[PDB]
Amino acid sequence: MWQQAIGDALGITARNLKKFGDRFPHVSDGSNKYVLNDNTDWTDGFWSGILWLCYEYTGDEQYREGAVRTVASFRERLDRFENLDHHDIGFLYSLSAKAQWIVEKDESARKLALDAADVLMRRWRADAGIIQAWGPKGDPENGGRIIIDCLLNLPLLLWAGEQTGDPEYRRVAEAHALKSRRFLVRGDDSSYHTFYFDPENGNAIRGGTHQGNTDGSTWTRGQAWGIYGFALNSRYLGNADLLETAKRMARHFLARVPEDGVVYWDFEVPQEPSSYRDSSASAITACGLLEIASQLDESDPERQRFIDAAKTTVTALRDGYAERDDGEAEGFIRRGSYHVRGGISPDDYTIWGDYYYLEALLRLERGVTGYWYERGR
């Protein structure tokens, strides 16, 4: 049963919209209140996504109008190019502008998403064959660095390619996804957080972490980005190798889920209650598991196993981590972690965790698949 779980999210969201106003939630910091920003981070799209999902579930225009207002903010953000010189254009615009196009076919929203996709293409580095994740072009430290999270920024490009017919979008996304599979994914099915290439020729330099415990550890959200990310790219590209990788990474993740069903922040640290968790990694994986299953043939016995693993994850989140709408709580699930070693919100709400938790509930209850691709594709 997912209706009551969704109900708490609907209540929390409706109240949040009236409190946040035109502001955007990011993460909490030691309390049940979200730290807010004026659309200046990489997570603003998750708020839009949540509003759109709530609208799709209820048909209640209070959610739609809030979403539309955030889209207007995104139109302004792009026109002013405020903090958009990085790869997170996908997370920001797929869940806001593209989402509105998916929900109600708004032409201006479609244009905004395409304008955004065009801006994201500026991050492509022809000489290295990758999308630069962080910093300005040529940045000494990150000029040739990619991160596994970027897999979720590719849908915006793939979608833009199918909308415009411009083969460049798919070419770049496919190349980046394949390069990610070869260098970000490890031989034991674990994964690196980031990887460095020579900006001049694309030679592989080394793998390295940013939010994981060590360069060779397994940041669980990173593993999660791989699971859902490779599955989303596999759908767009009809690439069986990417789907296989998503499955391998998923099995690796699942074999390391603790007794309460929600993962710790890194698989290579003490797997005991004293270690911080990352409910957001589990939420992302729940969506990834369902995505994987949707691409498997009905005759494949592992299909139902992936679906059940997803239901079990959502249940674990609902029962042990979900916030009830008590008129105060501003987040859907507790114990997410942003940057543990950096001491940044290690036991808090994360708006992305909230978005994926709700997307999983909508997938399970209504078959609503989010805003990574057109419905029916």
UniProtKB/Swiss-Prot annotation:
Optimum temperature is 45 degrees Celsius. Changing residue 149 to N: Large decrease in activity, but no significant conformational change. Its main location: cytoplasm. Pfam families: Glyco_hydro_88 (PF07470). It comes from the Bacteria. InterPro entries: 6-hairpin_glycosidase_sf, 6hp_glycosidase-like_sf, Glyco_hydro_88, UG_Glycosaminoglycan_Hydrolase. It is found in: Cytoplasm. Optimum pH is 6.0-6.5. The keyword Transmembrane does not apply. Catalyzes the hydrolysis of oligosaccharides with unsaturated glucuronyl residues at the non-reducing terminal, to a sugar or an amino sugar, and an unsaturated D-glucuronic acid (GlcA), which is nonenzymatically converted immediately to alpha-keto acid. This is Unsaturated glucuronyl hydrolase.
